[PDB]
């Protein structure tokens, strides 16, 4: 019951980390957000799309 | 004068001399229907969602 829930926690965590990576910054070349968050760009900008939208 | 109490066995005799309480009408307890009806009247006041079977309730 609490396990499958981790998915929620994980999501809320990713969203934040991102918001903090672009917090102070402009035109931050997206490969940087990637290597900082330690994840492939394709699904980063996959999400950043979702957030912008 | 509507004088409407309970347990007619309580009221005195002098108040029963056949002619003196014109039409003696009696109230029945409230069954599924009456309740159902009553139930539908009161539940109508508040915001009641769908999928609500009142009968099951009575």
């Amino acid at each position: 019951i609490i396990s499958t829930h981790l998915a929620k926690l994980y999501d809320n965590l990713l969203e934040q980390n991102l918001i903090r990576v672009i917090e102070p910054f402009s035109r931050v070349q997206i490969e940087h957000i990637s290597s900082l968050i330690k994840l492939s760009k394709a699904d980063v900008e996959r999400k950043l799309s979702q957030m912008i939208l | 004068v509507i004088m409407a109490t309970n347990r007619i066995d309580i009221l005195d005799s002098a108040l029963l001399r056949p002619g003196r309480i014109d039409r003696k009408i009696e109230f029945p307890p409230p069954n599924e229907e009456a309740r159902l009806d009553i139930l539908k009247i009161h539940s109508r006041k508040m915001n009641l969602t769908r999928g609500i079977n009142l009968r099951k309730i009575a």
């Binding site: 799309s49 912008i52 | 109508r44 006041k45 508040m46 915001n47 009641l48 769908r50």
Partner: protein, 376 residues
């Protein structure tokens, strides 16, 4: 009642034609017979232009004379043995009978005079509901706005939240009957929680409407919040297979398909009445949104990317955007030389300014107009 469906099917017969001379017409006529209707038969015949069987009309009118006779007589017996709450009821059967006989003025007057009686709430209110109902039936407007105000008061005083919901279903459907979808959004969208008013239509129809209008006038995160995540929709939106398919296609960025289902449903609207010629307003708008939603994440993108996505040729795509750009309904602008599209964001002020001035002018024109009148 009067059963709307008669009206809907009537409109169906009106259609661009389409003739046919199919299910519709004979469905109507079939419900003339069992309804011994009349005021139609001349009204409809004069409209559609196809009368015949002067005999049938006479039969219908005859039986009508029989029952109107009867109710009149019944009422007569009451006058000598009233029966306050009773009299009004026989009247309700009178004007109601005018509803089965679908004569507007008659049930109108009948109901009115019944209000002088009525006394209660369900009679003074719900009766009004029916009176307006006629409004919906005829395709009027004002006749309703003045009565929804009445019921509005009757509900504002006391009443309950059971009548208020039907009420919002009527008001809502109305809002759809005009270009006012925003007002219908919250109204209808909130009508999913409760919907006892199957009087008008069924539940899945209604569903398609509230989902339609919802998709149209809700924001993206409140679309996901109130519709895509509709507990009452999931069980229903699975019952369908059209609007939903479009709604999802949008929300999830699966455009190219979104379009097809959009056209489909459009071809399903012109059939309805609540939209009638709004089928042209709806799709227009639903074109913009996507174009908008597609750009919002880009400061520049190339046509062939878009065209490829939606699966249309460039030239046609360019031709489409050209409709929405000059109207400042879309914050794009195009460069055809390089086949590129860049997005210029708008300023809040620019929005209101254009809206404020438009609104101010409308009020000014109305002020002056009637000024001269009262001036002379």
């Amino acid at each position: 009642n009067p059963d709307l469906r008669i009206a809907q099917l009537r409109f169906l017969l009106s259609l661009p034609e389409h003739r046919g001379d199919a299910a519709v017409r004979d469905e109507l006529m079939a419900a003339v017979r069992d309804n011994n209707m009349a005021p139609y038969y001349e009204a409809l015949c004069k409209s559609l232009d196809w009368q015949i069987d002067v005999d049938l009309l006479n039969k219908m009118k005859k039986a009508n004379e029989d029952e109107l006779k009867r109710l009149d007589e019944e009422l007569e017996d009451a006058e000598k043995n009233l029966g306050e709450s009773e009299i009004r009821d026989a009247m309700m059967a009178k004007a109601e009978y005018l509803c089965r006989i679908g004569d507007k003025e008659g049930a109108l007057t009948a109901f009115r005079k019944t209000y002088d009686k009525t006394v209660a709430l369900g009679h003074r209110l719900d009766i009004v509901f029916y009176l307006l109902r006629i409004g919906l039936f005829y395709m009027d407007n004002d006749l309703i706005t003045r009565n929804t105000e009445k019921a509005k008061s009757l509900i504002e005083e006391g009443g309950d939240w059971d009548r208020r919901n039907r009420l919002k279903v009527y008001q809502g459907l109305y809002c759809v009957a005009i270009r006012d979808f925003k007002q219908a959004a919250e109204l209808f969208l909130d009508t999913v929680s409760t919907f006892t008013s199957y009087e008008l239509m069924d539940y899945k129809t209604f569903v398609t409407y509230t989902v339609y209008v919802s998709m149209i006038a809700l924001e993206r995160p409140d679309l996901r919040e109130k519709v895509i995540k509709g507990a009452e929709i999931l069980e229903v939106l699975h019952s369908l297979p059209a609007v939903r398919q479009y709604l999802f296609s949008l929300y999830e960025c699966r455009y190219s398909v979104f379009f097809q289902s959009l056209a489909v449903v459009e071809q399903e609207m012109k059939k309805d009445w609540l939209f009638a010629p709004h089928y042209r307003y709806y799709v227009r708008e639903m074109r913009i949104h996507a174009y908008s939603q597609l750009l919002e994440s880009y400061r520049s993108l190339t046509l062939g990317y878009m065209a490829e996505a939606f699966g249309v040729g460039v030239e046609f795509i360019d031709q489409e955007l050209s409709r929405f750009i000059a109207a400042g309904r879309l914050h794009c602008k195009i460069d055809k030389v390089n086949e590129i599209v860049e997005t210029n964001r708008p300023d809040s002020k620019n929005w209101q300014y254009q809206e404020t001035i438009k609104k101010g002018d409308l009020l000014l024109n109305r002020v002056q107009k009637l000024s001269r009148v009262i001036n002379m």
